[PDB]
Amino acid sequence: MTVKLDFEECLKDSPRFRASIELVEAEVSELETRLEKLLKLGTGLLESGR
Amino acid sequence: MTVKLDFEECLKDSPRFRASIELVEAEVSELETRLEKLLKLGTGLLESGR
């Protein structure tokens, strides 16, 4: 995440900066989708356990 | 059920024998129900654990 976003060029607004803003978002979305998969499997263990 | 029985009354056709053999067949009829309930209940446990 951190190094898929050029903080350095955020006032400058280069194609570098524009490439980064588009590239960083896919790992947040990946991650969000994996977090949900564990929250549901966790309740899955909570129901069969119980 | 009776605890530790021997032959005299049994062969002299005693009413004590006769009520004592009545009461153990019923304990064995109870026993079998308790077994098939324990079987199905431990089957559901094993399925719930798996």
PDB file of all heavy atoms in Angstrom, chain A residues 2-32:
ATOM      1  N   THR A   2       1.630   1.521   1.006  1.00  0.00           N
ATOM      2  CA  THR A   2       2.340   2.819   1.282  1.00  0.00           C
ATOM      3  C   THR A   2       3.187   3.263   0.130  1.00  0.00           C
ATOM      4  O   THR A   2       3.207   4.417  -0.260  1.00  0.00           O
ATOM      5  CB  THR A   2       3.235   2.844   2.503  1.00  0.00           C
ATOM      6  OG1 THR A   2       2.355   3.113   3.569  1.00  0.00           O
ATOM      7  CG2 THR A   2       4.176   4.039   2.480  1.00  0.00           C
ATOM      8  N   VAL A   3       3.810   2.247  -0.570  1.00  0.00           N
ATOM      9  CA  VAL A   3       4.807   2.593  -1.545  1.00  0.00           C
ATOM     10  C   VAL A   3       4.259   2.385  -2.919  1.00  0.00           C
ATOM     11  O   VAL A   3       4.881   2.772  -3.876  1.00  0.00           O
ATOM     12  CB  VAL A   3       6.004   1.725  -1.346  1.00  0.00           C
ATOM     13  CG1 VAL A   3       7.201   1.805  -2.380  1.00  0.00           C
ATOM     14  CG2 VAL A   3       6.599   2.180  -0.004  1.00  0.00           C
ATOM     15  N   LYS A   4       2.971   2.077  -3.059  1.00  0.00           N
ATOM     16  CA  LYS A   4       2.138   2.142  -4.285  1.00  0.00           C
ATOM     17  C   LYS A   4       1.442   3.508  -4.454  1.00  0.00           C
ATOM     18  O   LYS A   4       0.542   3.613  -5.282  1.00  0.00           O
ATOM     19  CB  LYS A   4       1.072   1.038  -4.250  1.00  0.00           C
ATOM     20  CG  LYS A   4       1.705  -0.281  -4.424  1.00  0.00           C
ATOM     21  CD  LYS A   4       0.539  -1.274  -4.201  1.00  0.00           C
ATOM     22  CE  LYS A   4       0.959  -2.763  -4.529  1.00  0.00           C
ATOM     23  NZ  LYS A   4      -0.097  -3.804  -4.230  1.00  0.00           N
ATOM     24  N   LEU A   5       1.737   4.464  -3.551  1.00  0.00           N
ATOM     25  CA  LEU A   5       1.206   5.820  -3.524  1.00  0.00           C
ATOM     26  C   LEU A   5       2.403   6.694  -3.249  1.00  0.00           C
ATOM     27  O   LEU A   5       3.035   6.652  -2.228  1.00  0.00           O
ATOM     28  CB  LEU A   5       0.034   5.953  -2.554  1.00  0.00           C
ATOM     29  CG  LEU A   5      -0.523   7.342  -2.335  1.00  0.00           C
ATOM     30  CD1 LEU A   5      -0.757   8.215  -3.581  1.00  0.00           C
ATOM     31  CD2 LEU A   5      -1.906   7.356  -1.585  1.00  0.00           C
ATOM     32  N   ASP A   6       2.684   7.528  -4.233  1.00  0.00           N
ATOM     33  CA  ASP A   6       3.820   8.563  -4.204  1.00  0.00           C
ATOM     34  C   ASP A   6       3.152   9.813  -3.441  1.00  0.00           C
ATOM     35  O   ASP A   6       2.309  10.615  -3.842  1.00  0.00           O
ATOM     36  CB  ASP A   6       4.199   8.890  -5.636  1.00  0.00           C
ATOM     37  CG  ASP A   6       4.951   7.808  -6.346  1.00  0.00           C
ATOM     38  OD1 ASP A   6       5.788   7.280  -5.604  1.00  0.00           O
ATOM     39  OD2 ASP A   6       4.945   7.682  -7.608  1.00  0.00           O
ATOM     40  N   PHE A   7       3.579   9.894  -2.111  1.00  0.00           N
ATOM     41  CA  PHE A   7       3.215  11.032  -1.252  1.00  0.00           C
ATOM     42  C   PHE A   7       3.938  12.304  -1.693  1.00  0.00           C
ATOM     43  O   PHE A   7       3.394  13.362  -1.667  1.00  0.00           O
ATOM     44  CB  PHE A   7       3.603  10.838   0.257  1.00  0.00           C
ATOM     45  CG  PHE A   7       3.198   9.503   0.862  1.00  0.00           C
ATOM     46  CD1 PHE A   7       3.908   8.973   1.958  1.00  0.00           C
ATOM     47  CD2 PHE A   7       2.058   8.788   0.368  1.00  0.00           C
ATOM     48  CE1 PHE A   7       3.535   7.785   2.549  1.00  0.00           C
ATOM     49  CE2 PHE A   7       1.645   7.709   1.070  1.00  0.00           C
ATOM     50  CZ  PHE A   7       2.367   7.149   2.130  1.00  0.00           C
ATOM     51  N   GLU A   8       5.156  12.087  -2.194  1.00  0.00           N
ATOM     52  CA  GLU A   8       6.204  12.959  -2.681  1.00  0.00           C
ATOM     53  C   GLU A   8       5.677  13.807  -3.781  1.00  0.00           C
ATOM     54  O   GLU A   8       5.987  15.008  -3.964  1.00  0.00           O
ATOM     55  CB  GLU A   8       7.548  12.097  -3.050  1.00  0.00           C
ATOM     56  CG  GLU A   8       8.571  12.649  -4.034  1.00  0.00           C
ATOM     57  CD  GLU A   8       9.443  11.642  -4.714  1.00  0.00           C
ATOM     58  OE1 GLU A   8       9.406  10.499  -4.212  1.00  0.00           O
ATOM     59  OE2 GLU A   8      10.054  12.007  -5.796  1.00  0.00           O
ATOM     60  N   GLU A   9       4.848  13.255  -4.675  1.00  0.00           N
ATOM     61  CA  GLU A   9       4.432  13.928  -5.889  1.00  0.00           C
ATOM     62  C   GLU A   9       2.974  14.342  -5.824  1.00  0.00           C
ATOM     63  O   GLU A   9       2.370  14.795  -6.777  1.00  0.00           O
ATOM     64  CB  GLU A   9       4.499  12.917  -7.059  1.00  0.00           C
ATOM     65  CG  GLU A   9       5.903  12.425  -7.520  1.00  0.00           C
ATOM     66  CD  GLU A   9       6.785  13.289  -8.397  1.00  0.00           C
ATOM     67  OE1 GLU A   9       7.567  14.140  -7.921  1.00  0.00           O
ATOM     68  OE2 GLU A   9       6.709  13.206  -9.658  1.00  0.00           O
ATOM     69  N   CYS A  10       2.356  14.272  -4.631  1.00  0.00           N
ATOM     70  CA  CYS A  10       0.982  14.646  -4.432  1.00  0.00           C
ATOM     71  C   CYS A  10       0.672  16.091  -4.578  1.00  0.00           C
ATOM     72  O   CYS A  10      -0.490  16.312  -4.865  1.00  0.00           O
ATOM     73  CB  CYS A  10       0.357  14.069  -3.055  1.00  0.00           C
ATOM     74  SG  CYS A  10       0.403  15.279  -1.641  1.00  0.00           S
ATOM     75  N   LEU A  11       1.571  17.086  -4.389  1.00  0.00           N
ATOM     76  CA  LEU A  11       1.354  18.487  -4.716  1.00  0.00           C
ATOM     77  C   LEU A  11       1.702  18.763  -6.108  1.00  0.00           C
ATOM     78  O   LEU A  11       1.072  19.618  -6.700  1.00  0.00           O
ATOM     79  CB  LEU A  11       2.212  19.416  -3.713  1.00  0.00           C
ATOM     80  CG  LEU A  11       1.838  19.251  -2.203  1.00  0.00           C
ATOM     81  CD1 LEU A  11       2.880  20.022  -1.370  1.00  0.00           C
ATOM     82  CD2 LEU A  11       0.432  19.807  -1.881  1.00  0.00           C
ATOM     83  N   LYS A  12       2.566  18.038  -6.746  1.00  0.00           N
ATOM     84  CA  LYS A  12       3.108  18.135  -8.065  1.00  0.00           C
ATOM     85  C   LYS A  12       2.158  17.631  -9.107  1.00  0.00           C
ATOM     86  O   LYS A  12       1.939  18.347 -10.092  1.00  0.00           O
ATOM     87  CB  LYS A  12       4.425  17.442  -8.175  1.00  0.00           C
ATOM     88  CG  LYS A  12       4.864  16.990  -9.641  1.00  0.00           C
ATOM     89  CD  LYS A  12       5.274  18.149 -10.477  1.00  0.00           C
ATOM     90  CE  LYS A  12       6.247  19.223  -9.836  1.00  0.00           C
ATOM     91  NZ  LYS A  12       7.607  18.629  -9.967  1.00  0.00           N
ATOM     92  N   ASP A  13       1.582  16.457  -8.892  1.00  0.00           N
ATOM     93  CA  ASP A  13       0.499  15.862  -9.785  1.00  0.00           C
ATOM     94  C   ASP A  13       1.026  15.390 -11.147  1.00  0.00           C
ATOM     95  O   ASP A  13       0.648  15.822 -12.288  1.00  0.00           O
ATOM     96  CB  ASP A  13      -0.826  16.679  -9.869  1.00  0.00           C
ATOM     97  CG  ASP A  13      -1.895  16.197 -10.854  1.00  0.00           C
ATOM     98  OD1 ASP A  13      -2.390  15.076 -10.629  1.00  0.00           O
ATOM     99  OD2 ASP A  13      -2.368  16.997 -11.664  1.00  0.00           O
ATOM    100  N   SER A  14       2.053  14.544 -11.099  1.00  0.00           N
ATOM    101  CA  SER A  14       2.723  13.966 -12.311  1.00  0.00           C
ATOM    102  C   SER A  14       1.901  12.718 -12.702  1.00  0.00           C
ATOM    103  O   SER A  14       1.041  12.293 -11.969  1.00  0.00           O
ATOM    104  CB  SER A  14       4.204  13.638 -11.907  1.00  0.00           C
ATOM    105  OG  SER A  14       4.347  12.883 -10.658  1.00  0.00           O
ATOM    106  N   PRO A  15       2.056  12.255 -13.971  1.00  0.00           N
ATOM    107  CA  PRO A  15       1.647  10.944 -14.415  1.00  0.00           C
ATOM    108  C   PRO A  15       2.092   9.809 -13.556  1.00  0.00           C
ATOM    109  O   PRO A  15       1.354   8.832 -13.408  1.00  0.00           O
ATOM    110  CB  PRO A  15       2.132  10.776 -15.909  1.00  0.00           C
ATOM    111  CG  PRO A  15       2.419  12.242 -16.346  1.00  0.00           C
ATOM    112  CD  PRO A  15       2.676  12.989 -15.073  1.00  0.00           C
ATOM    113  N   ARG A  16       3.231   9.870 -12.931  1.00  0.00           N
ATOM    114  CA  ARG A  16       3.669   9.117 -11.789  1.00  0.00           C
ATOM    115  C   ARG A  16       2.689   9.074 -10.646  1.00  0.00           C
ATOM    116  O   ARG A  16       2.281   7.987 -10.184  1.00  0.00           O
ATOM    117  CB  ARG A  16       5.176   9.592 -11.394  1.00  0.00           C
ATOM    118  CG  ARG A  16       5.557   9.244 -10.030  1.00  0.00           C
ATOM    119  CD  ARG A  16       7.040   9.440  -9.699  1.00  0.00           C
ATOM    120  NE  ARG A  16       7.259   8.833  -8.327  1.00  0.00           N
ATOM    121  CZ  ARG A  16       7.987   9.369  -7.354  1.00  0.00           C
ATOM    122  NH1 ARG A  16       8.775  10.437  -7.582  1.00  0.00           N
ATOM    123  NH2 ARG A  16       7.917   8.936  -6.131  1.00  0.00           N
ATOM    124  N   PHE A  17       2.223  10.281 -10.214  1.00  0.00           N
ATOM    125  CA  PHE A  17       1.266  10.420  -9.186  1.00  0.00           C
ATOM    126  C   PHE A  17      -0.078   9.858  -9.548  1.00  0.00           C
ATOM    127  O   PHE A  17      -0.642   9.002  -8.892  1.00  0.00           O
ATOM    128  CB  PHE A  17       1.129  11.977  -8.836  1.00  0.00           C
ATOM    129  CG  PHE A  17       0.182  12.095  -7.641  1.00  0.00           C
ATOM    130  CD1 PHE A  17       0.496  11.479  -6.409  1.00  0.00           C
ATOM    131  CD2 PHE A  17      -0.905  13.002  -7.627  1.00  0.00           C
ATOM    132  CE1 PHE A  17      -0.452  11.353  -5.385  1.00  0.00           C
ATOM    133  CE2 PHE A  17      -1.770  13.089  -6.461  1.00  0.00           C
ATOM    134  CZ  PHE A  17      -1.567  12.201  -5.403  1.00  0.00           C
ATOM    135  N   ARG A  18      -0.536  10.188 -10.806  1.00  0.00           N
ATOM    136  CA  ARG A  18      -1.749   9.602 -11.345  1.00  0.00           C
ATOM    137  C   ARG A  18      -1.744   8.132 -11.550  1.00  0.00           C
ATOM    138  O   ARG A  18      -2.787   7.501 -11.530  1.00  0.00           O
ATOM    139  CB  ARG A  18      -2.003  10.184 -12.773  1.00  0.00           C
ATOM    140  CG  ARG A  18      -2.425  11.698 -12.657  1.00  0.00           C
ATOM    141  CD  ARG A  18      -3.589  12.101 -11.739  1.00  0.00           C
ATOM    142  NE  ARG A  18      -3.874  13.543 -11.974  1.00  0.00           N
ATOM    143  CZ  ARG A  18      -4.787  14.114 -12.785  1.00  0.00           C
ATOM    144  NH1 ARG A  18      -5.535  13.492 -13.667  1.00  0.00           N
ATOM    145  NH2 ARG A  18      -4.657  15.430 -12.891  1.00  0.00           N
ATOM    146  N   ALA A  19      -0.570   7.508 -11.989  1.00  0.00           N
ATOM    147  CA  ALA A  19      -0.399   6.066 -12.075  1.00  0.00           C
ATOM    148  C   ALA A  19      -0.556   5.458 -10.640  1.00  0.00           C
ATOM    149  O   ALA A  19      -1.261   4.471 -10.454  1.00  0.00           O
ATOM    150  CB  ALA A  19       0.881   5.639 -12.701  1.00  0.00           C
ATOM    151  N   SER A  20       0.052   6.114  -9.620  1.00  0.00           N
ATOM    152  CA  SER A  20       0.040   5.564  -8.251  1.00  0.00           C
ATOM    153  C   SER A  20      -1.313   5.507  -7.603  1.00  0.00           C
ATOM    154  O   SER A  20      -1.623   4.464  -7.118  1.00  0.00           O
ATOM    155  CB  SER A  20       1.105   6.254  -7.357  1.00  0.00           C
ATOM    156  OG  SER A  20       0.799   7.594  -6.943  1.00  0.00           O
ATOM    157  N   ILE A  21      -2.095   6.581  -7.676  1.00  0.00           N
ATOM    158  CA  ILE A  21      -3.458   6.696  -7.222  1.00  0.00           C
ATOM    159  C   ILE A  21      -4.362   5.649  -7.852  1.00  0.00           C
ATOM    160  O   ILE A  21      -5.097   4.892  -7.107  1.00  0.00           O
ATOM    161  CB  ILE A  21      -4.085   8.121  -7.200  1.00  0.00           C
ATOM    162  CG1 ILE A  21      -4.409   8.610  -8.589  1.00  0.00           C
ATOM    163  CG2 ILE A  21      -3.101   9.060  -6.440  1.00  0.00           C
ATOM    164  CD1 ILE A  21      -5.069  10.014  -8.650  1.00  0.00           C
ATOM    165  N   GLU A  22      -4.233   5.337  -9.130  1.00  0.00           N
ATOM    166  CA  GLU A  22      -4.907   4.199  -9.659  1.00  0.00           C
ATOM    167  C   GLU A  22      -4.349   2.850  -9.202  1.00  0.00           C
ATOM    168  O   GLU A  22      -5.139   2.004  -8.812  1.00  0.00           O
ATOM    169  CB  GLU A  22      -4.808   4.224 -11.215  1.00  0.00           C
ATOM    170  CG  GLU A  22      -5.656   5.311 -11.826  1.00  0.00           C
ATOM    171  CD  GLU A  22      -5.694   5.133 -13.317  1.00  0.00           C
ATOM    172  OE1 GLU A  22      -5.923   3.970 -13.821  1.00  0.00           O
ATOM    173  OE2 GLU A  22      -5.473   6.085 -14.090  1.00  0.00           O
ATOM    174  N   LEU A  23      -3.014   2.632  -9.124  1.00  0.00           N
ATOM    175  CA  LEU A  23      -2.462   1.350  -8.665  1.00  0.00           C
ATOM    176  C   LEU A  23      -2.762   0.974  -7.241  1.00  0.00           C
ATOM    177  O   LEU A  23      -3.114  -0.193  -6.969  1.00  0.00           O
ATOM    178  CB  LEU A  23      -0.972   1.509  -8.844  1.00  0.00           C
ATOM    179  CG  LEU A  23      -0.177   0.160  -8.463  1.00  0.00           C
ATOM    180  CD1 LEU A  23      -0.575  -1.076  -9.347  1.00  0.00           C
ATOM    181  CD2 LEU A  23       1.351   0.405  -8.506  1.00  0.00           C
ATOM    182  N   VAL A  24      -2.684   1.938  -6.190  1.00  0.00           N
ATOM    183  CA  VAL A  24      -2.916   1.635  -4.782  1.00  0.00           C
ATOM    184  C   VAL A  24      -4.260   1.118  -4.391  1.00  0.00           C
ATOM    185  O   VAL A  24      -4.484   0.184  -3.591  1.00  0.00           O
ATOM    186  CB  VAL A  24      -2.487   2.766  -3.872  1.00  0.00           C
ATOM    187  CG1 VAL A  24      -3.270   4.034  -4.022  1.00  0.00           C
ATOM    188  CG2 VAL A  24      -2.334   2.233  -2.398  1.00  0.00           C
ATOM    189  N   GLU A  25      -5.343   1.560  -5.048  1.00  0.00           N
ATOM    190  CA  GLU A  25      -6.645   1.150  -4.757  1.00  0.00           C
ATOM    191  C   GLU A  25      -6.964  -0.363  -4.871  1.00  0.00           C
ATOM    192  O   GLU A  25      -7.761  -0.883  -4.093  1.00  0.00           O
ATOM    193  CB  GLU A  25      -7.667   2.014  -5.571  1.00  0.00           C
ATOM    194  CG  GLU A  25      -7.788   3.466  -5.096  1.00  0.00           C
ATOM    195  CD  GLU A  25      -8.929   4.309  -5.717  1.00  0.00           C
ATOM    196  OE1 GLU A  25      -9.754   3.746  -6.448  1.00  0.00           O
ATOM    197  OE2 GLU A  25      -8.913   5.584  -5.556  1.00  0.00           O
ATOM    198  N   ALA A  26      -6.243  -1.070  -5.782  1.00  0.00           N
ATOM    199  CA  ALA A  26      -6.612  -2.492  -5.964  1.00  0.00           C
ATOM    200  C   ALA A  26      -6.205  -3.305  -4.753  1.00  0.00           C
ATOM    201  O   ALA A  26      -6.969  -4.190  -4.397  1.00  0.00           O
ATOM    202  CB  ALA A  26      -5.876  -2.956  -7.229  1.00  0.00           C
ATOM    203  N   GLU A  27      -5.132  -3.051  -4.041  1.00  0.00           N
ATOM    204  CA  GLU A  27      -4.724  -3.770  -2.812  1.00  0.00           C
ATOM    205  C   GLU A  27      -5.628  -3.469  -1.651  1.00  0.00           C
ATOM    206  O   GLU A  27      -6.056  -4.435  -1.000  1.00  0.00           O
ATOM    207  CB  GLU A  27      -3.210  -3.478  -2.501  1.00  0.00           C
ATOM    208  CG  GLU A  27      -2.613  -4.380  -1.325  1.00  0.00           C
ATOM    209  CD  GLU A  27      -1.160  -4.084  -1.072  1.00  0.00           C
ATOM    210  OE1 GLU A  27      -0.559  -3.082  -1.659  1.00  0.00           O
ATOM    211  OE2 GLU A  27      -0.473  -4.646  -0.131  1.00  0.00           O
ATOM    212  N   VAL A  28      -6.111  -2.199  -1.417  1.00  0.00           N
ATOM    213  CA  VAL A  28      -7.226  -1.940  -0.470  1.00  0.00           C
ATOM    214  C   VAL A  28      -8.434  -2.758  -0.811  1.00  0.00           C
ATOM    215  O   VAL A  28      -9.073  -3.352   0.057  1.00  0.00           O
ATOM    216  CB  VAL A  28      -7.499  -0.426  -0.356  1.00  0.00           C
ATOM    217  CG1 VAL A  28      -8.501  -0.208   0.790  1.00  0.00           C
ATOM    218  CG2 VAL A  28      -6.195   0.254  -0.042  1.00  0.00           C
ATOM    219  N   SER A  29      -8.862  -2.803  -2.090  1.00  0.00           N
ATOM    220  CA  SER A  29     -10.051  -3.627  -2.373  1.00  0.00           C
ATOM    221  C   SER A  29      -9.918  -5.159  -2.188  1.00  0.00           C
ATOM    222  O   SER A  29     -10.867  -5.890  -1.828  1.00  0.00           O
ATOM    223  CB  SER A  29     -10.595  -3.356  -3.764  1.00  0.00           C
ATOM    224  OG  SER A  29     -11.649  -4.254  -4.082  1.00  0.00           O
ATOM    225  N   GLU A  30      -8.669  -5.663  -2.493  1.00  0.00           N
ATOM    226  CA  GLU A  30      -8.332  -7.060  -2.311  1.00  0.00           C
ATOM    227  C   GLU A  30      -8.500  -7.459  -0.858  1.00  0.00           C
ATOM    228  O   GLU A  30      -9.204  -8.334  -0.437  1.00  0.00           O
ATOM    229  CB  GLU A  30      -6.844  -7.357  -2.827  1.00  0.00           C
ATOM    230  CG  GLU A  30      -6.484  -8.890  -2.685  1.00  0.00           C
ATOM    231  CD  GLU A  30      -7.534  -9.707  -3.399  1.00  0.00           C
ATOM    232  OE1 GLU A  30      -7.839  -9.480  -4.621  1.00  0.00           O
ATOM    233  OE2 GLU A  30      -8.052 -10.685  -2.796  1.00  0.00           O
ATOM    234  N   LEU A  31      -7.898  -6.661  -0.028  1.00  0.00           N
ATOM    235  CA  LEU A  31      -7.802  -6.731   1.381  1.00  0.00           C
ATOM    236  C   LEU A  31      -9.126  -6.674   2.039  1.00  0.00           C
ATOM    237  O   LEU A  31      -9.446  -7.495   2.859  1.00  0.00           O
ATOM    238  CB  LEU A  31      -6.831  -5.524   1.893  1.00  0.00           C
ATOM    239  CG  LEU A  31      -6.774  -5.392   3.463  1.00  0.00           C
ATOM    240  CD1 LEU A  31      -6.015  -6.519   4.125  1.00  0.00           C
ATOM    241  CD2 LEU A  31      -6.185  -4.059   3.895  1.00  0.00           C
ATOM    242  N   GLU A  32      -9.962  -5.749   1.608  1.00  0.00           N
ATOM    243  CA  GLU A  32     -11.358  -5.651   2.072  1.00  0.00           C
ATOM    244  C   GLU A  32     -12.221  -6.854   1.856  1.00  0.00           C
ATOM    245  O   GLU A  32     -13.155  -7.273   2.542  1.00  0.00           O
ATOM    246  CB  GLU A  32     -12.001  -4.345   1.437  1.00  0.00           C
ATOM    247  CG  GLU A  32     -13.520  -4.155   1.794  1.00  0.00           C
ATOM    248  CD  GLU A  32     -14.019  -2.851   1.248  1.00  0.00           C
ATOM    249  OE1 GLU A  32     -13.671  -2.522   0.104  1.00  0.00           O
ATOM    250  OE2 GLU A  32     -14.843  -2.125   1.861  1.00  0.00           O
TER     251      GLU A  32
END
